[PDB]
Symmetry: C7
Subunit: 71 residues, 7 copies
């Protein structure tokens, strides 16, 4: 039920990573660490519902993260 | 009585998570950790009084939190 | 005379929690921890000298706190 | 003379606590901790040399402090 | 694949380092540390899609990094 | 010449403390600590080149400092 | 070539220190510490490509640094 528990079971699952600034990243979670830094495969940066960029793989730093939700 | 006791007593209960933006989340509290990162189930993001997003489950990082209130 | 001493003496007493914003919370202090996260019961959120919201119980994170004054 | 030495020497004396705002608190220093959180007695919040609020006692968090000057 | 595994695997490979302020750096990853500070060789600062500077080598601090993507 | 070595040697001497706020402090360095908090005597707060405030003694928190230059 | 190795090798060499507001410092690196605080000799503060100030010696706190590049 804890924050890390949820992230753990989202491995290989699609997730939404909400950033503090105002945009988001969506992709398949393939890794993470205790600081909540995360690694996404086949990711897309989203802004106002529009897919702006895509990455084969991206490591996001948890300090910028507002929230993470298994979609 | 302490911050963590209150959060612990609110498991499985509706709570309000106020962010440093007059921006908030409301949902059922299902998990948390010592950094005050929290996990809500059946959540909704509220902006200026209205629902702008919904999540089956969402992990919110405590560093962005202003306050949490059991509802 | 130390910060935590003053906070401890304020338990079950009315306090003012000033945030950086012109915003503040006023309520009965019922708990706290070493990081200055505090719990208020029968609380009010004040914006520019006016009550904009009320809460039965609220946990406020010390990281957003400018000062706390026992009333 | 170390920052901590100066603060210690200002106990029970009047001091100016400058905030990263243009705002400041002025009052009698009655306590402090290693993080530079400080407690003031018979304190006032000042803006451009004018009193905007008064406090019998107030705990100010060091994280928001720019500087402290004993007067 | 944990964050550090991906970064390690990217040594001598091309990477995109996105900073919290809209701009990015691109170059060959030649070094890094546990804080996610990174060293890029033959790097390019990019703003809105325009290369504005080139560096033989450049050390970027992880505290300002939003994300890192092995291209 | 490590950062701290340069500071220690400026004891009793005139220094310029540049803040990440657009202004600076100038005065005689009479103390400091490992966090780069510093104490200045006969200090002058300078803004846009003009002295806008003067202090007999002032403790400046290092977290708001951009740089320190021994004049 | 981790971050610190690169900085070490730049001792007594010209370096560019990029800051967060379109500001930068250029000078000869003569000292540094593990926090990436750095000391520069014969330094210039540059704003949007224009030299606005000069310092015989200056200690720059690493917390404000975005990047460092040996010239």
């Amino acid at each position: 039920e804890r924050p890390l528990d949820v992230i753990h079971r989202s491995l290989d699952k699609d997730v939404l990573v909400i950033l503090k600034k105002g945009f988001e990243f969506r992709g398949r979670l393939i890794g993470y660490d205790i600081h909540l830094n995360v690694v996404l495969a086949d990711a897309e940066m989203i802004q106002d519902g529009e897919v702006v960029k895509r990455y084969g793989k991206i490591v996001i730093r948890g300090d910028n993260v507002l929230a993470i939700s298994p979609t």
